C-alpha cells in the first residue's frame, strides 16, 4: 500500500472520539516527498524546461513568443513566491492525476501547479507581464479557477477546445438533423457536452411533404444522436455526452421521457443522451388548475402560423393553438405529466427541467430570442436563433448557437482577500480572452454566436465551504443574506467589467441596444432595492470591502447607458466537478453530499473530508440530504436573482420522500423563480 | 393457520437467476483444480435431478391432492420455483463457467450414476403412488418431498456453500443461497400438511408411520452415503459432508415433528459462513405557497 | 424452437394483485346503474370460475402429459399465474366492489347459470378425457384451452373494457388488462403445442381433428351468443360483444394454425381504446479445378 | 373470399393428374371484370383525365407539355391498339398494387397498364411523337422493362427519384463519415438503396492524430449508418435498406463479419444494413496454399505510402505490406475467414462476395479507378473516386460515387420479335433520358459521377422462362450456347447504340480516352473470337436475325475508335424483383427457385404458376435448388463475359448443403470469372 493513502486512510481511525483529520496533511506531504518529487522532471533552469516542452509538441510556441523570457521567468517567480502547499491529498492528486502534465508516455510529470498556474496566466495575458502577474496571484491565491477546459488545455498544442458546453437548436429538416449530428459529433470530438433542442423538431405521425404518418418524431432523432455521441467518445476515456431538450407541449413529450424509463425497450431507450424538458408557465398554470392539457403537433402549427412553436408565447398563444381547426393536438393530463415527471426524476434522475418563463421574465436579450433550452450541465441559459442548413449547393441560413467559457470564483478565498471586485475583474477579462481565442470550424452556428454575443459565464463554488467555515448554516437566513450581498457584488462588478471591456474596444454584444441593459430596464431592482447585508454578522464579512449602493447601480446603470455591455451573458454558476478538488472547495453553490467522501482509486480507498471540516464546524457542514429542500431552493433562488444565466441545481432526495415532495420541491423552485433544476440525487 | 403466511413468504421471495451476473465468478472457476471443478459440475447436476423431478413431478401432484385453493395456490407457486426458476439457475451457472462439452458430459453422467438413480426412482415412486382420497399414501409421499428438500439437496448444497464462506464463486453461491433459502420454507410447509395427515391417525397408525419414515430416512441415508463418498472423496470432504447431511436430516425430521435421529457434531465452520420511489398524487394545495 | 422464448415472454411479463391499488374504483362504481353493476358482477364471477377450472385442471393436466422439461417448466409458470396471481386478482376486484352477502349471492347465480356451466363443463369434460400416452386426447384438451384463453373469456372481459375505455373503473380494468395479456400468450402457447401434435398426423386424421375443431368451436359459440344477450341485453351492448366474441374466435383459430371462420369485422372503439447446416472444412483439392 | 382469389386457387386442386393452369386465365379475367373495371376512374375522353391528372397534382405538366395532344392521344391509341391481356392473375395484381396510380386516399385507380406505359414513353421521348410510340409498342409487347424506379415514377409529380442503386465511397474522416450518413439519409429518403464503402476506414484501435487506440473501426460507422437507414426510412412507406462494403484484407472484416451472427451483441449487430465482402485474387491464393494472411491497418499504410489499401493493387502490394515495418498487421488465417464467410452465408446469406481481381481484370475504366465494392444488389461494378468532404468553411473536394439507371431486356419477348437490336437500342435511349433528367441535389459526387460517366444499367430477365418455354434445360449446354449468343448481340448493339450517341451528341463520357474501349483493348476477344451458336437447335432460335459476326465487331471497334463512347457502363443484370410478375417472366438470368409460387396476400393465399409453366414443360422448369449450382455458375460466368457490370448471382442451396460445398461454389465461381455473388439461399 502507498504510505500516502495509508495516511489518508488515518482520517476515519477515531483518536479519542474525533477523525484525525491532521493526517490528510501528512497525507498529502507523503504524497508529495514519495511520489511527485520522485516523477517530477526537473530541467537545470526553466529556459531549458520550456525549450523542452516547446520542442516536444508539448506547449504553443505563438503564445509563449509574445514575452520575452524574462517576464516569463518573472511570471514562473511570481507563482512559485508563493510557495503554495496543498491542503489536502485529494487536491494534489486530483491536480496530478487529471491537469498535471505528463510525459508523452504518462510516465513522468513535467508541470507542477505553480507550471499549469504560470502557463495559464501568460496564456491568459496575450503578451502583458503586468497581467500576467496578476492572473498567477489570482490562481494561486486560488481566487479564481478557471474551468477544467481552460486549466487543463491553456497553452497546449496537442489540446482539445477551451470551451466544453455547446447548445445546438436543429431545425426541422432532415439536412438541419444531419448537420445537427455532424456538428454534435465534431462538437463531442473537441471534448465538449452538446446540448440540442428538438422541439422545433416535427412529433411521431406528421407528414414529411403531403405523406402522412411520415415522421418518426423526436425519439428517431434522439437514437440517432445518442449513437453519434456513442461514436465520437474520445477513446472512450470520457464517452460522448449529448443533451436533449424538448418543450413539454411537444405532442413527443411522452415519449420523450419514456427512454429514460428503466422498462424501455433498445429500440427506443437512449443511453448517452441526458433530456431536459422546458416547462413554460403555461403548464404549470394548467396543472395548477386541474385542467385538460394539450400537446401539440409543431409542423401544424408551423404550418398555420408560419413560425414553430417554441418560437411563439405558450402563455398566449396556447388557447389559440386549441381553438385552431388546422393545429393538431393531443389531450393529455398535466397533473399526470408531472407525476410522471417525478417518478422519471426518481428513477434516473431525469429530466432536467428548465422554467421557461423563470427564465425569460429576467433574461436580458429576449430581444434576440428567448431561451428555449439549457445546456448539458443545465445552467447555461441564453438566446439562440436555429439555423437552416440548405441543400449542399444552396448556401445555409446560420444562427445562434450557445457557448460560454466557464470559470468560478473561489467565495471563501475571494473573500478571505477582501477582493470581490479584482477577482471578478480579472476573470471576466481571462473569460473575454478565452471566447475570444476560440474559433469553432465545423460547427458555423456556435463561431457566429461566439463572435456576435461574446457570451462568458462566471460562476462561483465554495460557498457552503465557507459558511461552514465561518460559522453559518446553508439554510440559516444569515447565508442566503450574505449570497445575496456577494451575488449582488458579483454582478455589479461582472457588469462593470463587460461595460469597461465595451468603452476600450468600442464595440458591445450583436443586438445589443435591444438589451435590458441598453433600456435601462435590467438595473430597476438595483437602483431601487438595496442589496447590503441585514445581518450585522454577514455586514462583518464584508468589512473593509466596498459593497455598491443603490447610487453606485444608478451611477453604473449610467455608464452601461453611455458605453455599452461586451458580454451578452457573464455570469452562470456550474457544477464545477473536478476542478473543487484542486481548489479544496465545495462543489459550485450546492451544499455537500457527505461531510468526508469517500472514494476508491483504482484498487485503492482514500477519503476526501470538506475542506475546513473539524469538529468546531462538523455541525455547519450539514449533508445536502439532510436539509429542507425548500431552504436550498430559497438560497439558489437568492442566488438567481442576480446571475443572468442559470444555476446547476442539483435536488438531493431522501429515499423516504414519494414523488409528491418531489414534485412539490419543483413547484416551490417554479413559485421561487427557480430558472433550471439539474439533477434529482437520491440517497 | 399458516398458508396464507406461506403464501405471502413465497410470493415476496420470487427470483430469477438472471438478477444474478455470473460474470465475476470467471477467474475464482478457472482457477479451481480438475478435481474440484469436477465435483462442482457433478454436484449441481444433482441438484438439478432433483429439482427436475420436484417441479415436473412432486409439487404438481402433492397440489393435485391437497384440498383448499389457498394451499393449492402455494404448492402451484413451489412447483413453479423448483422447474422454471431452481432446475434453469443450474444452467446458467454452467453455461457460463463450462463449455458445451462438459456440460453435455454431466448430464450424460446424471443418467448412469447409480446412487442418483436409486434416489430419484424412490422419490418419485413414491410421488406416483398416491391415490386420490387415501391420506395416508398421500402422507408418505410428503415424507419423501420434505426428505428431498430438507435432507437430499444438502450433499449438494455443501460444496457451493463451502466455495462462498471462502470468498469463492460467490455469485453462483448467491443463486445456490436464494435456492436454499426457498427450499427451506418449501420443507417446513410440506412437513406442516404431512403433520395434519399424521395427528388424524390411530396410535397404532403413528407407530407404523414413524417406521415408515425411519426407514425410509435409513435406506435414503446409506445411499446418500455412497454417492457423498462417490463424489467428495477426489476433493478430500466426504467425511465432512456426512456430518452435514446428518445435520439436515435431523432439520428435515423435524420439519415433520419427530425426535432427531443423529447426535450433534462439528460442522464445517466455512460452510456455516457460507450460509422505485413510491408514487403519491398531487394535491390542490401543494401548489400554491 | 419455441418453449424458450415464450419462457422468456412469460416470467418478464410477472405481476402480482398487491401492485395495484383498487379503493378507488369506489368513485366510478357509485355512479353506475344497478344494470350495469349487476352485469359486471355476473361477468366478473363467470371469469373467475371459468379462470379456476384452469388453475385447478387445464394448464396442470396439460403439464402432466406434455413430454420435455422446459415445456413443462413453462406450463407449470402458467398454472401459477391462475392460481396464485389471477385467482387472486378476481378475488380483490370482488371484495373491493361488493360486500360478502353480494359477492355470495352473485356466484350462487352464476354457479346455477345455465350457459356458463353449459361452457364450464364442456371445456373440463375435455380435460377429464386426456388418457395417458393419447396424442389426439391431449390434443383435444389442447384445443379446449386454446378455446378457453383466446374465445371464451372475451364474451366477458369485454365489460371491463369498456368501462376501462371510458375512465371507468381504470385500477380493476388495468387488472383485468393484465390477466388478458397472460391469457393471450398462454393461448398461443398452447396453441402451438397442439399445432405440434396435428402436424405428426396423418392428412386423414388431420381433417378429423379440423372437424372435431370446427364443431366445438360451433357448440362453443352458439352457447356465447345466447349467453351474451343473457348478460348484455340490459345494458344494450349485446351487438357489439358479439362482434368481439367473432373477433377472438378467429385468434384462437390462428393460434392452432387454422383459417378463420369469421369475416372482419371492425370492433367498438371504446372497448379497442381500453385493449447452422453443418461446418465442414475445406480439405485442399477444392481450390482446383 | 374473392371469386379470383378462388379460382387462382383451383390451379392446385389436380384434376386428371395435371394442374389446372388454364385457371389462372379465368383468374385474372374475373379479377379485372370484378374489381379492375369496377375501381377504375373513367373519364368521358382522355384530354379530361390528363386535364384531371395534371391538375390533381398526379402528373407533371412539364414532360406533358412538349407534345400537342394529339401526339398524346395518338400515343395512348399506339398503346390500347395492341389489346393487351395479363396472362396470368399475378401480373395483373402485382401492376395494380405497386404499379398502377391511384388516387390520393388509395381508392380507385387512375392508370390502367396501357395509361402507365404511354406516359412512361412520353417521358422517355421528351417530346419526340414517333419516339414515344416506339417506346409504347417496346413495352406493351414487354420486350423491354424499365426498372421499379423508372417505371413507378415516371412521369409523376409525387415521384421518388428514378435511380434507387447508388454507391459511396466514405473517406477515412469524421467530416466524411458525417457526410455519408447525411447522403446516405437523403438518399435512402428518395427510396434509393445505398451500399457504402468502409475499406478506407482505419481499423479499430488505431490512432486518431497522435491519440493511439482511439478509433472504433468500422463497425462504429456500421451502427452509424444501420441507425441512419433506420431513420430514413422513406417517410414510414418501405424499411430503409442500405449495405455496407469491406475488403477482406481490411483488419476489422471479423468484426465486420461478426455483425451479422445470430448471437451478436446489441453493440454490435447491425439490423438493416447489408454487408458484402471484397475479395482480391491475393486472399483465394493465400487460401489455396493454406499459408496465413494478414489483415492489415489501413491508416498505417495510407501513412506510409501516402494512397489508401483499397487504392493500391494487393497482388503487388500485400508482400511490401507484409515485409514494412511500419504497416500494422495481425496474422489470420484465410482459410478460416473463408470457412467463415460461408458459415455466415448459411445461416443469413451474407455477406456478398465481390471477387475484385473478376471485377478488374475485365474492368474497361481501371484508368478512372478499379472497381472497389458493389451496390446493395451486387450488380453495379464502376470504378468510384472518394470525395474529400473538408471543414464547413472549406471547399469540398467532390469524387466520383456510383449510381446508374437500370432497365430489363424481357429475353422471351425480345427472342419472339426477333428485336434484340432495336428493344436494346431503345432500351439504351431511354436508360441514357433516365440519366441525364436524373439532379440529386444533396449527394455531389453522386450528381458529379452521373454527369460525367453516363453509366446506365441494361439487364435481362426471362431467362429461364425463355428456355423452358423452347425446351432447353437451363445447365444445358445449349442453355449457356443462347446465353453467349443473346448477350453478345446485347453488348455488341448496346455499344454500337452508345457510340452512335456519342456522335450524335459529339461528346463521349469524361475520361473515355484512357478506356479499354478507346484503345480497343476491349474488344479483343470479339474480333479473335465467334460468338455464333454452336448448336442447330440454338442457331435456329435466332432464325431471322443477324448475328453480329468477328467483321461486324471489327466494324464496331474502328466506329468506337472514331466517335468514342457515350456511357462508361452500359449492361447490369439487376434481380429485378416485383417487374417480373408484371411481365411475366421469371427473375433476372437466375433460374426459378420454384414451379409454382405459394404467397399470401392479406388474408388470402395465391398460387402463381412459372410464366409458361405446362406439363410438357414442367421438367424445364427445374426449380434452383434441385440444380447443380456449378453449372449454373458455368452459366452466369457464360453471361458475364459479356456484360461489363456485375450480375446479381444468387446461390440456391439444400438444407443438405455444408459450409465446405459452399466454399466449394465461391471458388468455382472465383475460378470461372465470376464478378460478384449475391445471395446464399437455402431450402
Ligand atoms: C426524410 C425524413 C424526414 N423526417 C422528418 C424529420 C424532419 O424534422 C421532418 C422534415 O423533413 P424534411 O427534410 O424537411 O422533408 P421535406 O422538406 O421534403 O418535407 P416538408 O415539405 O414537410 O418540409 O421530417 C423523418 O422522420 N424521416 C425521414 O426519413
Ligand atoms: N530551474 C527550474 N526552474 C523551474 C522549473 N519549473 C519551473 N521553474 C521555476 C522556478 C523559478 O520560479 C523559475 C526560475 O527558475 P530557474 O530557471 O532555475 O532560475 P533561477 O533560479 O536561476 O533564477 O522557474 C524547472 O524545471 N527548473
Ligand atoms: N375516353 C378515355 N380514353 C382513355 C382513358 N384512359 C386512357 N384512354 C385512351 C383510350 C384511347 O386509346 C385514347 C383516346 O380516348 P378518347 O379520348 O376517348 O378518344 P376518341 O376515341 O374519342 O377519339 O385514350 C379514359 O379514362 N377515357
Ligand atoms: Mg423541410
Ligand atoms: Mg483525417
Ligand atoms: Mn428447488
Ligand atoms: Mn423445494
Ligand atoms: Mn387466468
Ligand atoms: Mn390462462
Given at each position: 500500500?502507498?504510505?500516502?493513502?495509508?495516511?489518508?486512510?488515518?482520517?476515519?481511525?477515531?483518536?479519542?472520539?474525533?477523525?484525525?483529520?491532521?493526517?490528510?496533511?501528512?497525507?498529502?506531504?507523503?504524497?508529495?516527498?514519495?511520489?511527485?518529487?520522485?516523477?517530477?522532471?526537473?530541467?537545470?533552469?526553466?529556459?531549458?524546461?520550456?525549450?523542452?516542452?516547446?520542442?516536444?509538441?508539448?506547449?504553443?510556441?505563438?503564445?509563449?513568443?509574445?514575452?520575452?523570457?524574462?517576464?516569463?521567468?518573472?511570471?514562473?517567480?511570481?507563482?512559485?513566491?508563493?510557495?503554495?502547499?496543498?491542503?489536502?491529498?485529494?487536491?494534489?492528486?486530483?491536480?496530478?492525476?487529471?491537469?498535471?502534465?505528463?510525459?508523452?508516455?504518462?510516465?513522468?510529470?513535467?508541470?507542477?501547479?505553480?507550471?499549469?498556474?504560470?502557463?495559464?496566466?501568460?496564456?491568459?495575458?496575450?503578451?502583458?507581464?503586468?497581467?500576467?502577474?496578476?492572473?498567477?496571484?489570482?490562481?494561486?491565491?486560488?481566487?479564481?479557477?478557471?474551468?477544467?477546459?481552460?486549466?487543463?488545455?491553456?497553452?497546449?498544442?496537442?489540446?482539445?477546445?477551451?470551451?466544453?458546453?455547446?447548445?445546438?437548436?436543429?431545425?426541422?429538416?432532415?439536412?438541419?438533423?444531419?448537420?445537427?449530428?455532424?456538428?454534435?459529433?465534431?462538437?463531442?470530438?473537441?471534448?465538449?457536452?452538446?446540448?440540442?433542442?428538438?422541439?422545433?423538431?416535427?412529433?411521431?405521425?406528421?407528414?414529411?411533404?403531403?405523406?402522412?404518418?411520415?415522421?418518426?418524431?423526436?425519439?428517431?432523432?434522439?437514437?440517432?444522436?445518442?449513437?453519434?455521441?456513442?461514436?465520437?467518445?474520445?477513446?472512450?476515456?470520457?464517452?460522448?455526452?449529448?443533451?436533449?431538450?424538448?418543450?413539454?407541449?411537444?405532442?413527443?413529450?411522452?415519449?420523450?421521457?419514456?427512454?429514460?424509463?428503466?422498462?424501455?425497450?433498445?429500440?427506443?431507450?437512449?443511453?448517452?443522451?441526458?433530456?431536459?424538458?422546458?416547462?413554460?408557465?403555461?403548464?404549470?398554470?394548467?396543472?395548477?388548475?386541474?385542467?385538460?392539457?394539450?400537446?401539440?403537433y409543431p409542423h401544424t402549427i408551423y404550418k398555420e402560423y408560419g413560425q414553430h412553436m417554441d418560437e411563439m408565447d405558450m402563455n398566449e398563444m396556447y388557447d389559440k393553438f386549441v381553438d385552431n381547426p388546422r393545429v393538431k393536438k393531443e389531450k393529455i393530463n398535466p397533473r399526470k405529466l408531472l407525476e410522471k415527471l417525478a417518478m422519471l426524476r426518481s428513477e434516473s434522475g431525469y429530466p432536467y427541467i428548465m422554467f421557461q418563463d423563470n427564465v425569460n421574465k429576467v433574461h436580458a436579450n429576449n430581444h434576440i430570442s428567448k431561451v428555449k433550452f439549457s445546456?448539458?450541465?443545465?445552467?447555461?441559459?441564453?438566446?439562440?436563433?436555429?439555423?437552416?442548413?440548405?441543400?449542399?449547393?444552396?448556401?445555409?441560413?446560420?444562427?445562434?448557437?450557445?457557448?460560454?467559457?466557464?470559470?468560478?470564483?473561489?467565495?471563501?478565498?475571494?473573500?478571505?482577500?477582501?477582493?470581490?471586485?479584482?477577482?471578478?475583474?480579472?476573470?471576466?477579462?481571462?473569460?473575454?480572452?478565452?471566447?475570444?481565442?476560440?474559433?469553432?470550424?465545423?460547427?458555423?452556428?456556435?463561431?457566429?454566436?461566439?463572435?456576435?454575443?461574446?457570451?462568458?459565464?462566471?460562476?462561483?463554488?465554495?460557498?457552503?465551504?465557507?459558511?461552514?467555515?465561518?460559522?453559518?448554516?446553508?439554510?440559516?437566513?444569515?447565508?442566503?443574506?450574505?449570497?445575496?450581498?456577494?451575488?449582488?457584488?458579483?454582478?455589479?462588478?461582472?457588469?462593470?467589467?463587460?461595460?469597461?471591456?465595451?468603452?476600450?474596444?468600442?464595440?458591445?454584444?450583436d443586438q445589443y441596444e435591444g438589451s435590458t441593459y441598453a433600456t435601462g430596464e435590467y438595473f430597476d431592482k438595483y437602483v431601487s432595492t438595496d442589496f447590503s447585508p441585514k445581518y450585522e454578522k454577514i455586514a462583518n464579512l464584508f468589512e473593509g470591502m466596498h459593497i455598491p449602493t443603490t447610487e453606485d447601480w444608478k451611477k453604473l446603470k449610467a455608464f452601461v447607458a453611455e458605453h455599452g455591455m461586451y458580454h451578452s451573458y457573464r455570469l452562470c454558476i456550474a457544477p464545477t466537478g473536478s476542478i473543487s478538488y484542486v481548489?479544496?472547495?465545495?462543489?459550485?453553490?450546492?451544499?455537500?453530499?457527505?461531510?468526508?467522501?469517500?472514494?476508491?482509486?483504482?484498487?485503492?480507498?482514500?477519503?476526501?473530508?470538506?475542506?475546513?471540516?473539524?469538529?468546531?464546524?462538523?455541525?455547519?457542514?450539514?449533508?445536502?440530504?439532510?436539509?429542507?429542500?425548500?431552504?436550498?431552493?430559497?438560497?439558489?433562488?437568492?442566488?438567481?436573482?442576480?446571475?443572468?444565466?442559470?444555476?446547476?441545481?442539483?435536488?438531493?432526495?431522501?429515499?423516504?420522500?414519494?414523488?409528491?415532495?418531489?414534485?412539490?420541491?419543483?413547484?416551490?423552485?417554479?413559485?421561487?423563480?427557480?430558472?433550471?433544476?439539474?439533477?434529482?440525487?437520491?440517497? | 393457520?399458516?398458508?396464507?403466511?406461506?403464501?405471502?413468504?413465497?410470493?415476496?421471495?420470487?427470483?430469477?437467476?438472471?438478477?444474478?451476473?455470473?460474470?465475476?465468478?470467471?477467474?475464482?472457476?478457472?482457477?479451481?483444480?480438475?478435481?474440484?471443478?469436477?465435483?462442482?459440475?457433478?454436484?449441481?447436476?444433482?441438484?438439478?435431478?432433483?429439482?427436475?423431478?420436484?417441479?415436473?413431478?412432486?409439487?404438481?401432484?402433492?397440489?393435485?391432492?391437497?384440498?383448499?385453493?389457498?394451499?393449492?395456490?402455494?404448492?402451484?407457486?413451489?412447483?413453479?420455483?423448483?422447474?422454471?426458476?431452481?432446475?434453469?439457475?443450474?444452467?446458467?451457472?454452467?453455461?457460463?463457467?463450462?463449455?458445451?462439452?462438459?456440460?453435455?458430459?454431466?448430464?450424460?453422467?446424471?443418467?448412469?450414476?447409480?446412487?442418483?438413480?436409486?434416489?430419484?426412482?424412490?422419490?418419485?415412486?413414491?410421488?406416483?403412488?398416491?391415490?386420490?382420497?387415501?391420506?395416508?399414501?398421500?402422507?408418505?409421499?410428503?415424507?419423501?418431498?420434505?426428505?428431498?428438500?430438507?435432507?437430499?439437496?444438502?450433499?449438494?448444497?455443501?460444496?457451493?456453500?463451502?466455495?462462498?464462506?471462502?470468498?469463492?464463486?460467490?455469485?453462483?453461491?448467491?443463486?445456490?443461497?436464494?435456492?436454499?433459502?426457498?427450499?427451506?420454507?418449501?420443507?417446513?410447509?410440506?412437513?406442516?400438511?404431512?403433520?395434519?395427515?399424521?395427528?388424524?391417525?390411530?396410535?397404532?397408525?403413528?407407530?407404523?408411520?414413524?417406521?415408515?419414515?425411519?426407514?425410509?430416512?435409513?435406506?435414503?441415508?446409506?445411499?446418500?452415503?455412497?454417492?457423498?463418498?462417490?463424489?467428495?472423496?477426489?476433493?478430500?470432504?466426504?467425511?465432512?459432508?456426512?456430518?452435514?447431511?446428518?445435520?439436515?436430516?435431523?432439520?428435515?425430521?423435524?420439519?415433520?415433528?419427530?425426535?432427531?435421529?443423529?447426535?450433534?457434531?462439528?460442522?464445517?465452520?466455512?460452510?456455516?459462513?457460507?450460509?422505485?420511489?413510491?408514487?403519491?398524487?398531487?394535491?390542490?394545495?401543494?401548489?400554491?405557497?
Amino acid at each position: 500500500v502507498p504510505k500516502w493513502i495509508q495516511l489518508n486512510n488515518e482520517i476515519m481511525i477515531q483518536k479519542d472520539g474525533k477523525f484525525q483529520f491532521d493526517k490528510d496533511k501528512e497525507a498529502v506531504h507523503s504524497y508529495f516527498v514519495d511520489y511527485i518529487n520522485q516523477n517530477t522532471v526537473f530541467f537545470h533552469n526553466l529556459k531549458e524546461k520550456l525549450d523542452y516542452l516547446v520542442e516536444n509538441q508539448y506547449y504553443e510556441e505563438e503564445f509563449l513568443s509574445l514575452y520575452s523570457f524574462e517576464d516569463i521567468k518573472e511570471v514562473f517567480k511570481t507563482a512559485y513566491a508563493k510557495k503554495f502547499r496543498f491542503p489536502s491529498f485529494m487536491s494534489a492528486f486530483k491536480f496530478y492525476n487529471d491537469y498535471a502534465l505528463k510525459t508523452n508516455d504518462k510516465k513522468k510529470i513535467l508541470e507542477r501547479y505553480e507550471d499549469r498556474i504560470s502557463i495559464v496566466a501568460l496564456f491568459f495575458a496575450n503578451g502583458d507581464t503586468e497581467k500576467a502577474k496578476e492572473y498567477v496571484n489570482l490562481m494561486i491565491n486560488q481566487e479564481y479557477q478557471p474551468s477544467t477546459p481552460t486549466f487543463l488545455n491553456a497553452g497546449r498544442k496537442r489540446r482539445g477546445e477551451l470551451v466544453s458546453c455547446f447548445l445546438l437548436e436543429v431545425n426541422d429538416s432532415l439536412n438541419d438533423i444531419s448537420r445537427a449530428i455532424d456538428i454534435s459529433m465534431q462538437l463531442s470530438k473537441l471534448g465538449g457536452g452538446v446540448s440540442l433542442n428538438l422541439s422545433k423538431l416535427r412529433a411521431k405521425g406528421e407528414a414529411i411533404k403531403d405523406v402522412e404518418n411520415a415522421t418518426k418524431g423526436v425519439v428517431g432523432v434522439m437514437k440517432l444522436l445518442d449513437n453519434a455521441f456513442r461514436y465520437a467518445d474520445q477513446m472512450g476515456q470520457r464517452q460522448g455526452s449529448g443533451a436533449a431538450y424538448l418543450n413539454i407541449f411537444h405532442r413527443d413529450i411522452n415519449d420523450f421521457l419514456d427512454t429514460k424509463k428503466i422498462s424501455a425497450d433498445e429500440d427506443v431507450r437512449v443511453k448517452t443522451l441526458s433530456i431536459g424538458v422546458v416547462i413554460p408557465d403555461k403548464f404549470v398554470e394548467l396543472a395548477r388548475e386541474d385542467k385538460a392539457a394539450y400537446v401539440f403537433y409543431p409542423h401544424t402549427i408551423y404550418k398555420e402560423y408560419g413560425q414553430h412553436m417554441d418560437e411563439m408565447d405558450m402563455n398566449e398563444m396556447y388557447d389559440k393553438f386549441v381553438d385552431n381547426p388546422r393545429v393538431k393536438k393531443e389531450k393529455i393530463n398535466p397533473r399526470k405529466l408531472l407525476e410522471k415527471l417525478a417518478m422519471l426524476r426518481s428513477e434516473s434522475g431525469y429530466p432536467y427541467i428548465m422554467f421557461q418563463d423563470n427564465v425569460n421574465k429576467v433574461h436580458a436579450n429576449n430581444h434576440i430570442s428567448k431561451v428555449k433550452f439549457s445546456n448539458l450541465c443545465s445552467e447555461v441559459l441564453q438566446a439562440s436563433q436555429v439555423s437552416s442548413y440548405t441543400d449542399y449547393d444552396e448556401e445555409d441560413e446560420i444562427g445562434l448557437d450557445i457557448s460560454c467559457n466557464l470559470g468560478s470564483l473561489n467565495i471563501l478565498n475571494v473573500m478571505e482577500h477582501k477582493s470581490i471586485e479584482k477577482t471578478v475583474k480579472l476573470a471576466t477579462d481571462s473569460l473575454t480572452h478565452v471566447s475570444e481565442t476560440t474559433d469553432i470550424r465545423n460547427a458555423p452556428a456556435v463561431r457566429r454566436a461566439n463572435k456576435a454575443m461574446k457570451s462568458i459565464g462566471l460562476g462561483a463554488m465554495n460557498l457552503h465551504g465557507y459558511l461552514a467555515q465561518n460559522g453559518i448554516a446553508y439554510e440559516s437566513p444569515e447565508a442566503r443574506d450574505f449570497a445575496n450581498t456577494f451575488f449582488m457584488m458579483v454582478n455589479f462588478y461582472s457588469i462593470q467589467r463587460s461595460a469597461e471591456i465595451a468603452k476600450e474596444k468600442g464595440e458591445t454584444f450583436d443586438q445589443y441596444e435591444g438589451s435590458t441593459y441598453a433600456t435601462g430596464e435590467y438595473f430597476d431592482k438595483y437602483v431601487s432595492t438595496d442589496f447590503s447585508p441585514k445581518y450585522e454578522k454577514i455586514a462583518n464579512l464584508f468589512e473593509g470591502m466596498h459593497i455598491p449602493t443603490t447610487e453606485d447601480w444608478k451611477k453604473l446603470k449610467a455608464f452601461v447607458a453611455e458605453h455599452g455591455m461586451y458580454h451578452s451573458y457573464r455570469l452562470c454558476i456550474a457544477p464545477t466537478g473536478s476542478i473543487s478538488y484542486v481548489q479544496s472547495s465545495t462543489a459550485s453553490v450546492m451544499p455537500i453530499m457527505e461531510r468526508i467522501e469517500e472514494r476508491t482509486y483504482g484498487n485503492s480507498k482514500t477519503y476526501y473530508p470538506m475542506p475546513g471540516l473539524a469538529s468546531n464546524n462538523w455541525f455547519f457542514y450539514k449533508e445536502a440530504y439532510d436539509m429542507d429542500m425548500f431552504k436550498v431552493v430559497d438560497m439558489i433562488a437568492t442566488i438567481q436573482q442576480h446571475i443572468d444565466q442559470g444555476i446547476s441545481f442539483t435536488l438531493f432526495l431522501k429515499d423516504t420522500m414519494t414523488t409528491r415532495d418531489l414534485n412539490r420541491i419543483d413547484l416551490y423552485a417554479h413559485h421561487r423563480g427557480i430558472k433550471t433544476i439539474y439533477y434529482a440525487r437520491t440517497k | 393457520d399458516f398458508t396464507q403466511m406461506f403464501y405471502n413468504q413465497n410470493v415476496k421471495q420470487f427470483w430469477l437467476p438472471e438478477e444474478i451476473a455470473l460474470n465475476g465468478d470467471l477467474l475464482t472457476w478457472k482457477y479451481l483444480g480438475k478435481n474440484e471443478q469436477d465435483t462442482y459440475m457433478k454436484v449441481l447436476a444433482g441438484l438439478t435431478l432433483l429439482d427436475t423431478e420436484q417441479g415436473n413431478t412432486g409439487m404438481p401432484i402433492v397440489a393435485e391432492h391437497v384440498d383448499g385453493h389457498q394451499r393449492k395456490a402455494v404448492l402451484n407457486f413451489m412447483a413453479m420455483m423448483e422447474n422454471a426458476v431452481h432446475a434453469k439457475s443450474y444452467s446458467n451457472i454452467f453455461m457460463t463457467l463450462a463449455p458445451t462439452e462438459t456440460i453435455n458430459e454431466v448430464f450424460e453422467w446424471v443418467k448412469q450414476n447409480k446412487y442418483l438413480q436409486k434416489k430419484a426412482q424412490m422419490i418419485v415412486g413414491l410421488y406416483k403412488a398416491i391415490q386420490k382420497d387415501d391420506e395416508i399414501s398421500l402422507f408418505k409421499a410428503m415424507v419423501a418431498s420434505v426428505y428431498l428438500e430438507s435432507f437430499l439437496f444438502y450433499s449438494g448444497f455443501y460444496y457451493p456453500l463451502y466455495f462462498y464462506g471462502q470468498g469463492k464463486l460467490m455469485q453462483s453461491g448467491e443463486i445456490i443461497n436464494l435456492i436454499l433459502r426457498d427450499e427451506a420454507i418449501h420443507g417446513v410447509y410440506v412437513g406442516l400438511l404431512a403433520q395434519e395427515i399424521y395427528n388424524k391417525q390411530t396410535e397404532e397408525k403413528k407407530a407404523e408411520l414413524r417406521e415408515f419414515a425411519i426407514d425410509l430416512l435409513n435406506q435414503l441415508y446409506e445411499n446418500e452415503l455412497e454417492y457423498t463418498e462417490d463424489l467428495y472423496d477426489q476433493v478430500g470432504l466426504s467425511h465432512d459432508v456426512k456430518k452435514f447431511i446428518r445435520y439436515n436430516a435431523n432439520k428435515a425430521l423435524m420439519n415433520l415433528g419427530f425426535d432427531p435421529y443423529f447426535e450433534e457434531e462439528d460442522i464445517n465452520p466455512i460452510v456455516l459462513n457460507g450460509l422505485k420511489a413510491t408514487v403519491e398524487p398531487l394535491k390542490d394545495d401543494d401548489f400554491y405557497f
